[PDB]
Structure formats: C-alpha cells, structure tokens
Amino acid sequence: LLEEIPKWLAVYSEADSSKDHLLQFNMFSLPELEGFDSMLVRLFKQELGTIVGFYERYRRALILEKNRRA
Amino acid sequence: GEFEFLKFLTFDDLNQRLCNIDHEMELEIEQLNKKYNAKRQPIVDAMNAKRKRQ
Ligand code: NI
C-alpha cells in the first residue's frame, strides 16, 4: 500500500508516555524500525501543517475584521 | 464562519489577539516538538541496540 502509516502508530503518538516501556521494539527488523521512525516524522509534519495553517486563517480572519470596521 | 466570534470583539480585543498570535504559535510548535521527540526515543533507542548487537 502507498505510504501506509499503521493506525496503531497514530494512536501511539497521540497517547501519553505511561505505557511506553511495554513496547517490544526489539521484535522488529532494523528496516521496519527505520520505517516507524520516518512515519512519526511525517505525523509531526502533518500536525505541524495543521497548526501553521490554522494560524494562517486566524491571522487573516483578524485583519479582515479590523479593516471591515474601518 | 470559523471565526465568527471576532465580530463581537472590540477593536482593541482584535489588536490584542494579533499581538499574541506569533508567541502563541511558537509555544504550540515547541509542545509539538517535545511530544514527538519523546515518542521517537523508544524507537531510536531500539535501533541503536540493533546496530550495537549486530
Ligand atoms: Ni505498497
């Protein structure tokens, strides 16, 4: 499948650190673990683009509203 | 639409929000950076162990 990110990985990144330790990452091959790592990084960028996109609109919404009053 | 509530703000309130917007983003991004770094550590530690084991 194309650019697949396993659902469990997404859940993992959104959860807290409490049950981190019980991850048997040893069971995976080095390539799969490099896979997981790079997927987290994509997840970061997604969430980052969302954050940064919101603040685009928000800023633009504000300035539009100011001009309106003037 | 998404920001309809801004129509209820005073003119100063709008400026005040425009004042705070950058810093507000920088905090958000920092919390994000911290979040993912701590999520990667387990994986990165494992790879290091694989590399040392083999
Ligand atoms: Ni495929």
Swiss-Prot record, chain A:
Residues 22-69 form the SARAH domain. Phosphorylated by Hpo. Third instar larvae eye disk, expressed in a stripe in the morphogenetic furrow, decreases in the region of the second mitotic wave (SMW) and increases once again posterior to the SMW. Disulfide bonds: none annotated. Interacts with Wts via its WW domains. Interacts (via FBM motif) with Mer (via FERM domain). Interacts with Kibra. Interacts with Hpo (via SARAH domain). Interacts with jub. Plays a key role in the Hippo/SWH (Sav/Wts/Hpo) signaling pathway, a signaling pathway that plays a pivotal role in organ size control and tumor suppression by restricting proliferation and promoting apoptosis. The core of this pathway is composed of a kinase cascade wherein Hippo (Hpo), in complex with its regulatory protein Salvador (Sav), phosphorylates and activates Warts (Wts) in complex with its regulatory protein Mats, which in turn phosphorylates and inactivates the Yorkie (Yki) oncoprotein. This is Scaffold protein salvador. It comes from Drosophila melanogaster. The gene is sav. The chain holds residues 531 to 600 of 608 of the full protein.
From Swiss-Prot, chain B:
Residues 3-50 form the SARAH domain. It comes from the Eukaryota. It is found in: Apical cell membrane; Cytoplasm. Induction: Transcriptionally regulated by Gcm (Glial cells missing). Autophosphorylated. Expressed in CNS during embryogenesis. In third instar larvae, it is expressed throughout all imaginal disks. Plays a key role in the Hippo/SWH (Sav/Wts/Hpo) signaling pathway, a signaling pathway that plays a pivotal role in organ size control and tumor suppression by restricting proliferation and promoting apoptosis. The core of this pathway is composed of a kinase cascade wherein Hippo (Hpo), in complex with its regulatory protein Salvador (Sav), phosphorylates and activates Warts (Wts) in complex with its regulatory protein Mats, which in turn phosphorylates and inactivates the Yorkie (Yki) oncoprotein. Belongs to the protein kinase superfamily. STE Ser/Thr protein kinase family. STE20 subfamily. Homodimer. Interacts with Sav and Wts. Interacts (via SARAH domain) with Ex. Interacts with Kibra. This is Serine/threonine-protein kinase hippo. It comes from Drosophila melanogaster. The gene is hpo. The chain holds residues 606 to 659 of 669 of the full protein.
